[PDB]
């Protein structure tokens, strides 16, 4: 059903980005905040707010160029049907280093560019292309 | 310190011996899906205190019979 909520999060981002929507809403969680705040610090989105404490509702502000999609495509890599893990030197790049790869480690959620100074590996979340 | 396995008991009918099953998660060499692999060992049970479904701690010993090579340490949880 909603068994991969991160893949449900990537579905709601990719649709409203392409369909010229100004802002989207989604059910919040701890892990969804730990991904959207990284995308806010990497220039892909604008802002996020939390609403509700018994039903946590996350909101995302979209971002455009001249009415053109900033996030052109995003790819869920690991999934509950097949888990993907890499080491500190087998971290894949997106568009040969242009896009970022969201990898959550013990030192929080960071990119593979940020995992060079950290020297860790773990679960690949999404290819932000 | 020494080599030590942990698991649960699937059979206890025979005297002075129990059957402890060990499960492990294996990356498949072709696809990568983590698969539960069952390892069924025969463990020497002194005084026959182990029942069904007991999470138990076992260690390594010499071969005591045709099929047995493992011995008992202590029971973590009994008869819940």
């Amino acid at each position: 059903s909603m068994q991969d909520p991160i893949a449900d999060m990537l579905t709601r981002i990719r649709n409203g980005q392409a369909a010229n929507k100004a802002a989207v809403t989604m059910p919040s969680s701890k892990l969804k905040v730990a991904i959207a705040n990284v995308l806010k610090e990497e220039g892909f989105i604008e802002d996020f707010k939390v609403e509700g404490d018994t039903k946590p509702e996350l909101e995302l502000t979209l971002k455009y160029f001249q009415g053109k999609a900033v996030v052109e495509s995003i790819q869920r890599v690991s999934r509950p049907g097949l888990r993907i893990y890499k080491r500190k030197d087998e971290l894949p790049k997106v568009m040969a280093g242009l896009g970022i790869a969201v990898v959550s480690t013990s030192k929080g959620v960071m990119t593979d560019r940020a995992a060079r100074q950290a020297g860790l590996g773990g679960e690949i979340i999404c290819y932000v292309a | 310190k020494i080599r030590t396995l942990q698991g649960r008991v699937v059979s206890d009918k025979m005297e002075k011996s129990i059957v402890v099953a060990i499960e492990r998660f294996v990356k498949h060499p072709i696809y990568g899906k983590f698969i539960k692999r069952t390892t069924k060992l025969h463990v020497h049970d002194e005084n026959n205190e182990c029942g069904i479904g007991d999470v138990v701690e076992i260690r390594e010993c010499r071969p005591l019979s045709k099929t047995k090579s493992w011995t008992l340490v202590r029971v973590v949880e009994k008869a819940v």
Partner: peptide
């Protein structure tokens, strides 16, 4: 198509 289907039986090489 499913990876979990190939756990039961792999792709049958002719």
């Amino acid at each position: 198509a499913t990876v979990n289907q190939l756990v039961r039986k792999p792709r049958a090489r002719k």
